[PDB]
């Protein structure tokens, strides 16, 4: 079936930068819009970034601002970002999924349908004290 | 949460209510008036609790200070006598946990702020940090008195009330009269702040607490006990190696009761003096007859009757028992398709 | 359960009119309210009319007050919606919707039709 | 001790007539305003045999 | 001040269970709550109480007892930008139905097969969230809807808020039945010379 | 011959107001009305002097020193049907109360917000009457209700 | 401001026993009255029993003498019927109602709850 | 409930005023085998009313 | 419905420890009481100990207080009633049994168990 590995997840220090990826594997990259998400602990799901199927429009979310460099490639049909100046409000799950497949309910219809393929989810923590 | 270091214990102490503790009982305006008032008041001549929060010593014992934990039943005054506005708040509540409910008064330094949330308070809070070398000399760390703030029900902010005090020398410059009171849901604080020139107790004389707020929490309230802002001893000139320590301050605490007083209400809208009629017999005379003096004569103030000491019942001499021997004790009892039946009628069973 | 279908769109000259018509089925009736929408592109909707079964609360634009007429027919269970002098403003997606307006509750658009397009142009759609 | 007596619930739920009048259907004010009025005639039958 | 809201015919729908309406501003309350979220059109019916579907069961559920106000509104303007608007999701499969006023904020997988996949995604192992795919040319019946929910509860407690109050004056010489916020009574109102202190 | 009528247990109300049932055979009256209509169970109790809601205020009103009887039975038999009975109106919105025994049966529409809506045409402007919708397979307290004054 | 609470129905073979219960709330009682009335289809309301709060002059119809008994709690601020000798017509619709049963002026219901149903049958509901 | 001791032996009605109280009679009965001085309804044409 | 289940009897030297394990089975509950009693040959029952479930209404006869201690575990629908200090006249036949302890209403023994049997002796049973 359709698969979504998410790795680069660890505890980096605030005010620096990592990287992190998604191997996506089960479909053609470019049949389905693909992108991330990133969870706080306490809060719901969040779109941070997102590659178009063609890379087209790429759009990102400004809550990151201009803290961003997501790139796919098509041989190893694999998704890339990075985190720059890192602060503690970013330490969150990011997970990586595509779209392409959205429900198709008619008035009073049937709600059952395709729906789109999502990841693993790796966590990230920023923090200025160092670890053990 | 921080348990502090090493706290000096010592005897608590009393002091003479005096005619102090008397707040305005109502949003009313009466003019050159005698009025009676039963209300929770603090009874005059009081022994009213006396805590202190000066660590300064000579050497021998060192950090003295006063937080406990104290019951709140009808009502409370409190009263103040700091020339450091180290005391910037209080907690209220039932079980100062988590569980029921509690309620935080903490007065910045600029807008003071009142919130009602079930919090996880501290065994021992403080306000942090109040010395330098840090965030400025004076800090409110919210969270170094709780650390959870689930599930809020009230929250409010407004011009402070701490900060009125004038001149820093000279024992103490200002005490400053709150009185707290729980009833039927609002909770009403009444405050003043008065010039004082002595120390060691309060000051004769007589002044009306007017009302600040009355906020509808509709919280319980059963305990409490005082926020106090402490210097933290980890950069201090004076022994700063890990602890804390404080300068010179101290608070009153009393409890009213419902009692039955003669309000003085001047051409104004203005309490000026003030009878307590249950005192003395004298307070008695003046309150019957509703004025502050009493000529020459014999009064009928009230009325004496010996209480009951005890109670007792008297009832004849029970014996005509009940034959329940015969049907509980009986040697052969009947089948139960044909039951036996007997009938019991006057009788004691 | 209930669909919603439309009909009468196109295209009309500037000053011209047009008749858009839709009708129901699987609604247990009750309190039907039937209300036009117009979608401009680039824009949320924009209430264009609507009518209760017999109860005659019927609603227009600020705008449009003249323009529209709005009526109905219970036994085909269809709502009409005339239009005269349309100007080039008018131009949009339109759709209807089957709800309940209820005096002492309020309205819901329970449901939506498909839509059909009204195209005010010069040179036609 | 006649200008007292105003302040006097004589057993309604208030001496105000206005606050009993303002707060509580007629039928059931009725008998509270009749209340207020036994006591007050009371008040003014005592002062005036004094 | 609810009558912004219910005097606009800028919503799709503004519809009160237990509470009149137009009749707002007299009735008040103790506590309210503003729920918000957003939904699809066709879907703005399972946001009622009685009715069975996904989110009836699923994402955010009315009791039958119902006290509020629903307001639902297209918001194809604002969400969806040009080619999708993922933002916004919904939980699509759920071992147990939600009780009335309930949040379930986990991402667990949901299995219907015969072994926990614990971790793994593929045949009957779903991630539980779908997300919707919010473009503008896509029919009313999928476009974006803002969906409030005003939940009105009356405790012991204090009462709170309540709507606004009219007001007029009639001031010298004229015998008026008056009310000064509560205080009722009947006479003539004269300026005076009294000096209230502030409180 | 009242008395016929309160011994019959065949009425779900029969409160008097100012008399006694049992009194009335007794008496000789002056003039005596009979006010006759249909209202659902959950609004049996606003027909009481000093009541307030719906029907106490826009629709029949009870002066405060009322006296006489008020008998009220179901009529879930005569008056609900399978595919409902939409016959019976009451008033819904009304500018201002009504005096006691004051009828009213206008049906100019009423305008509920702040939309002068002069005409059929209008937002949120209510036709003032509204029907009961009495199905028999509502409970109890939504059925109809006879009520005779 | 009030509700009314029913439980204890269902089915049961003629010649059984049963028992209904209805819980009040919303009172300031003083001359509360609890009565359950019995909706036959096709029928109207018909009484089956009433009871004050203490009052105790309760009533019951001819034709159901001996086999319903009515029994209140003051403190649960509930009563409940007991039902024997469950005779076929017994298949109904039971409501209880709540009102005040003055000496004087006569009596009302009030407030109505939601009712339960019995099933006097040889194979149940 | 209903049983056969309930229902043909001793019944009793369902708004019972009185108590129950049983305890074992080992002691008192049982002696040996050779005890059965007790009967019980097994058969009966209806059920007994209270 | 009800089915009792006992465990744990045997024989024991004087002074020694015993357990006994009682399993119920076909109970709604609410308010359980267990109680364990003992029968010596040649004569009635006599209380030995007596719980209600989460209620902690203990009983412990007179003779045995000490040698008689008891638990148990509703996860596990089961009640241990362990013994330290096991005397001669102990040697009996102990019955799990169970009913209804309601503290307004009184104590009651809906059914008894298979029962086990307790010797106290120096050769074993």
């Given at each position: 079936?359709?698969?979504?590995?998410?790795?680069?997840?660890?505890?980096?220090?605030?005010?620096?930068?990592?990287?992190?990826?998604?191997?996506?594997?089960?479909?053609?990259?470019?049949?389905?819009?693909?992108?991330?998400?990133?969870?706080?602990?306490?809060?719901?799901?969040?779109?941070?970034?997102?590659?178009?199927?063609?890379?087209?429009?790429?759009?990102?979310?400004?809550?990151?601002?201009?803290?961003?460099?997501?790139?796919?490639?098509?041989?190893?049909?694999?998704?890339?970002?990075?985190?720059?100046?890192?602060?503690?409000?970013?330490?969150?799950?990011?997970?990586?999924?595509?779209?392409?497949?959205?429900?198709?309910?008619?008035?009073?219809?049937?709600?059952?349908?395709?729906?789109?393929?999502?990841?693993?989810?790796?966590?990230?923590?920023?923090?200025?004290?160092?670890?053990? | 949460?921080?348990?502090?270091?090493?706290?000096?214990?010592?005897?608590?102490?009393?002091?003479?209510?005096?005619?102090?503790?008397?707040?305005?009982?109502?949003?009313?305006?009466?003019?050159?008036?005698?009025?009676?008032?039963?209300?929770?008041?603090?009874?005059?001549?009081?022994?009213?609790?006396?805590?202190?929060?000066?660590?300064?010593?000579?050497?021998?014992?060192?950090?003295?200070?006063?937080?406990?934990?104290?019951?709140?039943?009808?009502?409370?005054?409190?009263?103040?006598?700091?020339?450091?506005?180290?005391?910037?708040?209080?907690?209220?509540?039932?079980?100062?946990?988590?569980?029921?409910?509690?309620?935080?008064?903490?007065?910045?330094?600029?807008?003071?702020?009142?919130?009602?949330?079930?919090?996880?308070?501290?065994?021992?809070?403080?306000?942090?940090?109040?010395?330098?070398?840090?965030?400025?000399?004076?800090?409110?760390?919210?969270?170094?008195?709780?650390?959870?703030?689930?599930?809020?029900?009230?929250?409010?902010?407004?011009?402070?009330?701490?900060?009125?005090?004038?001149?820093?020398?000279?024992?103490?410059?200002?005490?400053?009269?709150?009185?707290?009171?729980?009833?039927?849901?609002?909770?009403?604080?009444?405050?003043?702040?008065?010039?004082?020139?002595?120390?060691?107790?309060?000051?004769?004389?007589?002044?009306?607490?007017?009302?600040?707020?009355?906020?509808?929490?509709?919280?319980?309230?059963?305990?409490?006990?005082?926020?106090?802002?402490?210097?933290?001893?980890?950069?201090?000139?004076?022994?700063?190696?890990?602890?804390?320590?404080?300068?010179?301050?101290?608070?009153?605490?009393?409890?009213?009761?419902?009692?039955?007083?003669?309000?003085?209400?001047?051409?104004?809208?203005?309490?000026?003096?003030?009878?307590?009629?249950?005192?003395?017999?004298?307070?008695?005379?003046?309150?019957?007859?509703?004025?502050?003096?009493?000529?020459?004569?014999?009064?009928?103030?009230?009325?004496?009757?010996?209480?009951?000491?005890?109670?007792?019942?008297?009832?004849?001499?029970?014996?005509?028992?009940?034959?329940?021997?015969?049907?509980?004790?009986?040697?052969?009892?009947?089948?139960?398709?044909?039951?036996?039946?007997?009938?019991?009628?006057?009788?004691?069973? | 359960?209930?669909?919603l279908?439309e009909?009468g769109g196109?295209?009309?000259?500037?000053?011209?009119?047009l008749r858009l018509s839709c009708?129901?089925?699987?609604?247990?009736?009750?309190?039907?309210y039937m209300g036009w929408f117009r979608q401009v592109?680039?824009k949320g909707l924009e209430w264009v009319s609507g009518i209760?079964?017999?109860?005659?609360?019927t609603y227009y634009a600020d705008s449009v007050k003249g323009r529209f007429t709005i009526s109905?027919?219970?036994?085909?269970?269809?709502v009409y919606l005339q239009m005269n002098?349309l100007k080039?403003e008018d131009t949009a997606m339109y759709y209807c919707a089957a709800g309940?307006?209820?005096?002492?509750?309020?309205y819901?658009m329970?449901?939506w039709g498909?839509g059909t397009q009204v195209?005010v142009?010069?040179?036609?759609? | 001790?006649?200008?007292?007596?105003?302040?006097?619930?004589?057993?309604?739920?208030?001496?105000?007539?206005?606050?009993?009048?303002?707060?509580?259907?007629?039928?059931?004010?009725?008998?509270?305003?009749?209340?207020?009025?036994?006591?007050?005639?009371?008040?003014?039958?005592?002062?005036?045999?004094? | 001040?609810?009558?912004?809201?219910?005097?606009?015919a800028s919503?799709s729908?503004?519809?009160?269970?237990?509470?009149?309406?137009?009749?707002?501003?007299?009735?008040?309350?103790?506590?309210?709550?503003?729920?918000?979220?957003?939904?699809?059109?066709?879907?703005?019916?399972?946001?009622?109480?009685?009715?069975?579907?996904?989110?009836?069961?699923?994402?955010?559920?009315?009791?039958?007892?119902?006290?509020?106000?629903?307001?639902?509104?297209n918001?194809?303007?604002?969400?969806?930008?040009?080619?999708?608007?993922?933002?916004?999701?919904?939980?699509?499969?759920?071992?147990?139905?939600?009780?009335?006023?309930?949040?379930?904020?986990?991402?667990?997988?949901?299995?219907?097969?015969?072994?926990?996949?614990?971790?793994?995604?593929?045949?009957?192992?779903?991630?539980?969230?779908?997300?919707?795919?919010?473009?503008?040319?896509?029919?009313v019946?999928?476009?974006?809807?803002?969906?409030?929910?005003?939940?009105?509860?009356?405790?012991?407690?204090?009462?709170?808020?309540?709507?606004?109050?009219?007001?007029?004056?009639?001031?010298?010489?004229?015998?008026?039945?008056?009310?000064?916020?509560?205080?009722?009574?009947?006479?003539?109102?004269?300026?005076?010379?009294?000096?209230?202190?502030?409180?």
């Amino acid at each position: 079936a359709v698969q979504l590995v998410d790795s680069g997840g660890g505890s980096v220090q605030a005010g620096g930068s990592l990287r992190l990826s998604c191997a996506a594997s089960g479909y053609t990259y470019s049949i389905c819009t693909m992108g991330w998400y990133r969870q706080a602990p306490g809060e719901g799901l969040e779109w941070v970034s997102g590659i178009n199927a063609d890379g087209s429009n790429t759009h990102y979310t400004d809550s990151v601002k201009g803290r961003f460099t997501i790139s796919r490639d098509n041989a190893k049909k694999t998704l890339y970002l990075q985190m720059n100046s890192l602060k503690p409000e970013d330490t969150a799950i990011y997970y990586c999924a595509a779209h392409g497949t959205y429900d198709k309910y008619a008035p009073c219809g049937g709600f059952a349908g395709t729906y789109t393929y999502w990841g693993q989810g790796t966590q990230v923590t920023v923090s200025s004290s160092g670890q053990a | 949460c921080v348990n502090l270091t090493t706290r000096t214990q010592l005897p608590p102490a009393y002091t003479n209510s005096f005619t102090r503790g008397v707040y305005y009982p109502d949003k009313v305006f009466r003019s050159s008036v005698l009025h009676s008032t039963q209300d929770l008041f603090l009874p005059f001549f009081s022994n009213v609790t006396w805590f202190h929060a000066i660590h300064v010593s000579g050497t021998n014992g060192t950090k003295r200070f006063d937080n406990p934990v104290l019951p709140f039943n009808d009502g409370v005054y409190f009263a103040s006598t700091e020339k450091s506005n180290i005391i910037r708040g209080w907690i209220f509540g039932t079980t100062l946990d988590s569980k029921t409910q509690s309620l935080l008064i903490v007065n910045n330094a600029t807008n003071v702020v009142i919130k009602v949330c079930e919090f996880q308070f501290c065994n021992d809070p403080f306000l942090g940090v109040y010395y330098h070398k840090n965030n400025k000399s004076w800090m409110e760390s919210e969270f170094r008195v709780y650390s959870s703030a689930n599930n809020c029900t009230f929250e409010y902010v407004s011009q402070p009330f701490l900060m009125d005090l004038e001149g820093k020398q000279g024992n103490f410059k200002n005490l400053r009269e709150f009185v707290f009171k729980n009833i039927d849901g609002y909770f009403k604080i009444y405050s003043k702040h008065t010039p004082i020139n002595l120390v060691r107790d309060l000051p004769q004389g007589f002044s009306a607490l007017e009302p600040l707020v009355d906020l509808p929490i509709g919280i319980n309230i059963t305990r409490f006990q005082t926020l106090l802002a402490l210097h933290r001893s980890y950069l201090t000139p004076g022994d700063s190696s890990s602890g804390w320590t404080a300068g010179a301050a101290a608070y009153y605490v009393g409890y009213l009761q419902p009692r039955t007083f003669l309000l003085k209400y001047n051409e104004n809208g203005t309490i000026t003096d003030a009878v307590d009629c249950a005192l003395d017999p004298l307070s008695e005379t003046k309150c019957t007859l509703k004025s502050f003096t009493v000529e020459k004569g014999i009064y009928q103030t009230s009325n004496f009757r010996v209480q009951p000491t005890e109670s007792i019942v008297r009832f004849p001499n029970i014996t005509n028992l009940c034959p329940f021997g015969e049907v509980f004790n009986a040697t052969r009892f009947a089948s139960v398709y044909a039951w036996n039946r007997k009938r019991i009628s006057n009788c004691v069973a | 359960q209930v669909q919603l279908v439309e009909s009468g769109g196109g295209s009309v000259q500037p000053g011209g009119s047009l008749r858009l018509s839709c009708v129901v089925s699987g609604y247990t009736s009750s309190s039907r309210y039937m209300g036009w929408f117009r979608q401009v592109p680039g824009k949320g909707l924009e209430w264009v009319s609507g009518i209760k079964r017999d109860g005659t609360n019927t609603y227009y634009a600020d705008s449009v007050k003249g323009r529209f007429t709005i009526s109905q027919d219970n036994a085909k269970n269809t709502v009409y919606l005339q239009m005269n002098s349309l100007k080039p403003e008018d131009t949009a997606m339109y759709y209807c919707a089957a709800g309940s307006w209820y005096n002492q509750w309020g309205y819901s658009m329970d449901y939506w039709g498909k839509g059909t397009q009204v195209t005010v142009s010069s040179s036609g759609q | 001790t006649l200008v007292k007596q105003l302040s006097s619930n004589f057993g309604a739920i208030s001496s105000v007539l206005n606050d009993i009048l303002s707060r509580l259907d007629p039928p059931e004010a009725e008998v509270q305003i009749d209340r207020l009025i036994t006591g007050r005639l009371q008040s003014l039958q005592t002062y005036v045999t004094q | 001040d609810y009558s912004v809201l219910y005097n606009s015919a800028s919503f799709s729908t503004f519809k009160c269970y237990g509470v009149s309406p137009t009749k707002l501003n007299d009735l008040c309350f103790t506590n309210v709550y503003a729920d918000s979220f957003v939904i699809r059109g066709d879907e703005v019916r399972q946001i009622a109480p009685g009715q069975t579907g996904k989110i009836a069961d699923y994402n955010y559920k009315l009791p039958d007892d119902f006290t509020g106000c629903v307001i639902a509104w297209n918001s194809n303007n604002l969400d969806s930008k040009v080619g999708g608007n993922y933002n916004y999701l919904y939980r699509l499969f759920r071992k147990s139905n939600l009780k009335p006023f309930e949040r379930d904020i986990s991402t667990e997988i949901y299995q219907a097969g015969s072994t926990p996949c614990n971790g793994v995604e593929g045949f009957n192992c779903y991630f539980p969230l779908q997300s919707y795919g919010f473009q503008p040319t896509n029919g009313v019946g999928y476009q974006p809807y803002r969906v409030v929910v005003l939940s009105f509860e009356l405790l012991h407690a204090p009462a709170t808020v309540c709507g606004p109050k009219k007001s007029t004056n009639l001031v010298k010489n004229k015998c008026v039945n008056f009310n000064f916020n509560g205080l009722t009574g009947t006479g003539v109102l004269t300026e005076s010379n009294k000096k209230f202190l502030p409180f």
